[PDB]
Symmetry: D2
Amino acid sequence: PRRRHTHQRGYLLTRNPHLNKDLAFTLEERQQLNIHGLLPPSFNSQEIQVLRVVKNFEHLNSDFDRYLLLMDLQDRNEKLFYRVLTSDIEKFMPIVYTPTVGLACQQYSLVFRKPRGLFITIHDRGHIASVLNAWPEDVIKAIVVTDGERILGLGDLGCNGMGIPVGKLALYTACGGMNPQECLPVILDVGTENEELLKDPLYIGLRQRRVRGSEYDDFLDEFMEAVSSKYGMNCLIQFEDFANVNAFRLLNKYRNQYCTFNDDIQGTASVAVAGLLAALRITKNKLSDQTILFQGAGEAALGIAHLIVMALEKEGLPKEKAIKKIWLVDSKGLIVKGRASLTQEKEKFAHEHEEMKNLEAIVQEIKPTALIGVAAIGGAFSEQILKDMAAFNERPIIFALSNPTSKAECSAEQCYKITKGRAIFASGSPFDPVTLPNGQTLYPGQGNNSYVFPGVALGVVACGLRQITDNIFLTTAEVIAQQVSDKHLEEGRLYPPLNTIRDVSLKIAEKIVKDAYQEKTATVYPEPQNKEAFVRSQMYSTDYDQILPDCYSWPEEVQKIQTK
Amino acid sequence: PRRRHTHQRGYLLTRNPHLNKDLAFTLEERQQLNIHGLLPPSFNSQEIQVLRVVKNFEHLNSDFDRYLLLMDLQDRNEKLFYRVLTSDIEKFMPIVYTPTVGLACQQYSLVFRKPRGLFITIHDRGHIASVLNAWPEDVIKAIVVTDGERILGLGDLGCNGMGIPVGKLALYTACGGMNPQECLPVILDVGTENEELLKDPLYIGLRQRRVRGSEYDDFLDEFMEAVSSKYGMNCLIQFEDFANVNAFRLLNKYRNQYCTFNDDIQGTASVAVAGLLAALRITKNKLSDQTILFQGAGEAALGIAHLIVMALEKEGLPKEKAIKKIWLVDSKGLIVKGRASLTQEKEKFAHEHEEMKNLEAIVQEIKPTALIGVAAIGGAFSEQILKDMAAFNERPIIFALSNPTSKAECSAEQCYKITKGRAIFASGSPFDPVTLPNGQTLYPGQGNNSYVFPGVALGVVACGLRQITDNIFLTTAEVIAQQVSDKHLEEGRLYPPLNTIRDVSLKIAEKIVKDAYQEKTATVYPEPQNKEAFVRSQMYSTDYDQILPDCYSWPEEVQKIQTK
Amino acid sequence: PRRRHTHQRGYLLTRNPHLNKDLAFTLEERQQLNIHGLLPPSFNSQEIQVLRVVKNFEHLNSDFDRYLLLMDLQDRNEKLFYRVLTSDIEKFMPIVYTPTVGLACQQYSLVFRKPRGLFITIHDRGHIASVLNAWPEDVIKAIVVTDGERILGLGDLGCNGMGIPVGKLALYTACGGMNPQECLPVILDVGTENEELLKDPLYIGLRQRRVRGSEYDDFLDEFMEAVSSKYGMNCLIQFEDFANVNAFRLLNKYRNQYCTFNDDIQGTASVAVAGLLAALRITKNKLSDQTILFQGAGEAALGIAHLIVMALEKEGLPKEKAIKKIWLVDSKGLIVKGRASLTQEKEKFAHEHEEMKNLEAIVQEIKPTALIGVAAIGGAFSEQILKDMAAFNERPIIFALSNPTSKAECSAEQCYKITKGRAIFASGSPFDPVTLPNGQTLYPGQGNNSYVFPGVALGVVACGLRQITDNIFLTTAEVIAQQVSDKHLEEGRLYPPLNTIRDVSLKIAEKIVKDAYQEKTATVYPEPQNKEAFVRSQMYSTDYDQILPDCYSWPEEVQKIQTK
Amino acid sequence: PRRRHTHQRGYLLTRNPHLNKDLAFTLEERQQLNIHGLLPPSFNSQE
Ligand SMILES: NC(=O)C1=CN([C@@H]2O[C@H](COP(=O)(O)OP(=O)(O)OC[C@H]3O[C@@H](n4cnc5c(N)ncnc54)[C@H](OP(=O)(O)O)[C@@H]3O)[C@@H](O)[C@H]2O)C=CC1
Ligand SMILES: NC(=O)C1=CN([C@@H]2O[C@H](COP(=O)(O)OP(=O)(O)OC[C@H]3O[C@@H](n4cnc5c(N)ncnc54)[C@H](OP(=O)(O)O)[C@@H]3O)[C@@H](O)[C@H]2O)C=CC1
Ligand SMILES: NC(=O)C1=CN([C@@H]2O[C@H](COP(=O)(O)OP(=O)(O)OC[C@H]3O[C@@H](n4cnc5c(N)ncnc54)[C@H](OP(=O)(O)O)[C@@H]3O)[C@@H](O)[C@H]2O)C=CC1
Ligand SMILES: [Mn+2]
Ligand SMILES: [Mn+2]
Ligand SMILES: [Mn+2]
């Protein structure tokens, strides 16, 4: 059992969620910590505390209510919170994170109770260092930061966006073993364009429009300097839920000098590629053999596309051959050389070709082996698309990644029905198992970002990686796919079970760490004997620490009170 | 505004519900307190904070949910909690106290989240003083203590009875202006005879049967020494929800030596007598002239009967004559001289008479002018009973005090219908107004303990009364009756409106204070010239204290830094 | 200024020597820190504070009393302490360190007032980690540890030796700008061989003889692990005043794994070599042209000679031929091949020659160009030896490094007299300037270890050097030599003035930093543009930090308290 | 003896002259109060 020898005592100790064990404090602990009397006279194991929380949890009426209970728990007893979450990760993850946290964010100003994380405003420009001083933990190793401009698929929720870093970091700990005491959730509030928040008497954020331009850019620059300067260059800074243009610009500006990544961009690319690589073990061919069409050409599309191209390069295909294997379709139709409304990013995939608008005709023309939906238009993979995909391919790869299911390009039911059970399918949001007329039940998995960010963070931090390369994400994808068993693939699953996520994370971290020592990118020395054991030692446990003073005697001769 | 300069700073300040203002902290406060950045960047007035709480309160679906919300509030921001409560005292009183606190106590072990008050067990015997040391407020002026043996009419709830002192003290503050920082809810856990709880894995108390006899009595003795020793002999100790024999025994043992009362006995007495004194203004006769019949002969009845006797003595009637004006019925029937099953206390009212069992007959024989239900038998005041009462009395006084409504001896509807609108009626649980055939609308009042205890406590503590005499409760009954206007009486109310409870408490306190300095019973000197203003100055306000340091300049010459 | 935002307030703030300004706190600072009233009502500039201290210092009767006064200052107001020291380092250095600290250590148990530093005993074996936890500063970058077995020339002073690490770390700050808050003095008490201490009722250490052997070695291993584990592998650990065999064994065992050095061995080497390199600018010839005779063969001689050999090798000489340039004399006389009583270390200088035991004849035989005294035998450089050195050499280099004065191999007076003014002289202890017969005055300097260790520590920590090589000491010696002007060399000074010592340290650290980036040994990234400005930014100023909260407004619109 | 239960621990406890016993703090007091290591390893009676 770990130590932690606190100087805190009495009432204020019970107010620190990292020290407070509530009823799991033993009589000895209570008396020694000067809190005996502040708790009822029973001693609970952690399991009994978990039963109590779960009894409450079940009598609630909704997931939002269940979220409120769990956030209350987080703010009173951090270890019990994590014990609860880890006790059934697949059940608790969608409560503290997506999709429920979506509603939590929409509702954040109304239900606002106890604050979590640090709020830094445009009006703190020049003072970010001193805002950091307000945070009561000095040793921070991981920051998740948002500006609330692009929350999930809900858009600009300004300061209400604070629900995202808080819940995301809960998953860093629960799924990846990051120390919660070492994690800092951050919102930068530069204003909001959210009309309802601007009108709303209860809104907790700055009641102003967003600050744009170089004032915004300088602010972010100060943010990066203040945080790395205070917590050291090794501190991970993860961007979440910024607007695309911002997310891309900020990632490119900083990635080469700070320990930073953007999960919406790079993590998405990673888990999508993991799924593709897993699928390859069913189609029994190479990435090189694929023709990939993206339904959508936005942040997810370009991120995934980028990473696929490197995977192709890694197979031994030159960049320009690599690129020609990938077609995009945006809201105006296929991306072709010299089409109107193209961006610099879309341009990279604008091959010479007739312009087309109709996705059915696009499918018939391109004949992809892999069709990836990241456009947020529900039902875009029509019956005709699915028949055509199953006609051109023995085992068509079909990813409906748009969330929630009401947005999915197709359902698993339609996908398997129309492709006569031949499709290799993955989704963004959970679909139930599907049983074919031959009595086999297929279990389509989700390309959940959680498979990526926890392990990456743990890896990067454990070995002191100063930079987070594209290769980190490609490597990570290979590790995930590797955890998928032949048995899983045969059941139609392209991702390891969600209930294993702790282990998947461990393996991702193991690999990054192993790699870092081998290519001398690690900064933590001396090099560990055993890389598995070392990563494990860096992982937060849900068991309570001991916090009692270390008490031990000396030989009586030298322990005696001298007199004369 | 009150100035209270805190030395607390940073995170831990926000964790103290006496310091924490939430979003009502100004920018200046936040920066000065080293918490700037721990809150979202909006600044709320107290009225805006209330609105947030009320919106959430109105989204909830049960009184229990409402109770849990307000209790979470109490533990985060005490001032805002009291601001919410006092915003609509009549609405909020039944949520934080009775009847809702009844369910809270049944569910206490299940919903246990953030502890409140001080738990002292039989096993801390000989160490009570060191248990007290855990309480983070040194200055304590009021204590409510239970052993949980008799929580409401719910029986032995042992350690689950902590809901009662906590909720009771909330009303001390809300209704009487007692400073919550100076209030200490206590449970003594000596075990429980509650069998579900002894079996309940979640039970927060000592999983054992109650300690009885002299070990119990000695423990209580230590409690009174430790408490009076630490907080001084002026600290008010109120007993609540003890079993019958204990309640009387403890009250009798200590009331002469400590500043102590029992509210189930003496407060009930005071509020019942107040309703009688008010009724007398309708029946236009003396207390002398009354014949009182109690349905029930427990804590309530015996307390009420004692104070009526004391009132009769005041008017000038000898004690043995006063006693003969009062008859009691227990579960065994009428209390008469030389009946089987008589406690020492019931003996005092056993007059020579034929034994009787049936309440209808008893009423027909005794022909009371006033009939008081304190037996918790619902519907005991049958049509025949009421008919009888209206037959022998021009204006029969009828108190149906049993709680809740289901246990009331009759409804207001029944009582008025069957007595042809003639009865003077009061109850323990609220009934809607009744409009009679003659176009009169009557508004039957509730004999709420809340009219009494907050004012008594405020008064006693304000002037430093060392003992709480019978006289205090009688004068209190008088003060309460005085706040009833003839308009009220003509409307059939025997109590002031509930929404004026703060004003009632002040008048009660004013009276106690004036009396104590008159009869030199006060211990707080020098005597204030203006007792009204002095009491008011002792009342807690729901406005935020200023906690920032006192900043002010000195003349230039003496403020300057000395160099050369 | 520099900003250090504390959460401490009220009395306890004044008790923290890093926060306390005493009378230099402004009225604003006082009111804001909740300490207004705890100080008399005058506001002093730091200079006024210094004037008060120095007046007190000048009225005292002994250097011992002055030491106690300054040590009392250190423990009340750290910044003022350092301000005082640095106002006249030549004056104050000999009070807080040698020779006064020698007497302090002899008297430590008698005068023990307020503790300084951390005490770790053999009896804490297995629990050193938890002893570290008592230290109130979490961020430690420099540790000075002794076991007290060889304090100065006063032998084994056991626990009383704690005065050495305290006084040494004062010089690290005063002379080199190490942050004292980041410094940790440590005594390891494994017992003492000092019989008078063992007998003394007041002795503050373990009343037992020294644990030897594997138990000792394992204890030291845990210490290294515990300290490097808590404070990190970049934390500088400097050994001081261990017995010889221990000092060497420990240094060799750890120098390749930990960021460690031993100042008695390696710092002595560096400063002595610096003096030699400076002398070469008078003799105007090369190091390889010298013949060096050591009076003594102890820790100092072996260490100095080792570094001379390296400097010769650098100039271009193979090792075996450089060794030939150095002759050692011990208590059994000259070291020569096959001789009785030879340690393996002496063996390295055991050349082919006949045994001799008379220093005078040894001189006459060897005809050294350089005579280095480190044998502690007062007066060993006799008039005859001084005549011989003057006869064989135009400018004989003569170092009487033995400490204090009474142990010097010769005085400045005698050296200059008998060598008729041509000796190039330096000592370990200060001698007054010497007026020669021709009325010119020479100013022999001191080979004071303070020229070396402050700058080495500053440099190593600034760039995060993980190991401290012999080259560091050689380079450092060169840098110090470079700081000596020609004019100084003509005044008989081999060392830069003590009053520039901060500047010397800065130069030394600049050089270490410049080299560490050049040769890819630095661990602090990114690489700074200006090494000079970088090092200087890391140096602790004696100017008071600002500790008030950072207060600043927001535009009126967003700072406004919101209502309805 | 009289008992005064302090919530103060570690370095700052030693800076309170009503709490601080110097070398009269026993090894157990020192370890309990999180000050073990801040004093030399001998225990003094008041005399
Ligand atoms: N791990 C997962 O499960 C993840 C799933 N996703 C899902 O992917 C979807 C897209 O996300 P993201 O890339 O961030 O969103 P963006 O807004 O960046 O991308 C939207 C893209 O869809 C395009 N589009 C809109 N209508 C059509 C249409 N009718 N036909 C073709 N393309 C169309 C837009 O076109 P234009 O460029 O012309 O506007 C744009 O290219 C979301 O539903 C998100 O939930 C995202 C990340 C992770
Ligand atoms: N201000 C208010 O609203 C207050 C209301 N009350 C109400 O009064 C009621 C009694 O409270 P309390 O006095 O504390 O309770 P106790 O339990 O102390 O007394 C109950 C009495 O009722 C008697 N009783 C039981 N059954 C019958 C029966 N069938 N016929 C006649 N008498 C019977 C019991 O008889 P025995 O002695 O034989 O057991 C006992 O004397 C409760 O319902 C309570 O809510 C109380 C205080 C204040
Ligand atoms: N910067 C400075 O000014 C420094 C000065 N010094 C000074 O140098 C002196 C030596 O210190 P250190 O080397 O640590 O001490 P040690 O005790 O390690 O070495 C002393 C040496 O003197 C030898 N010796 C003893 N008697 C004689 C003799 N009659 N003739 C010749 N040699 C003799 C001893 O011989 P054996 O091996 O036979 O015992 C031993 O070699 C001390 O006075 C110290 O103050 C030291 C470090 C730094
Ligand atoms: Mn996101
Ligand atoms: Mn009660
Ligand atoms: Mn030394």
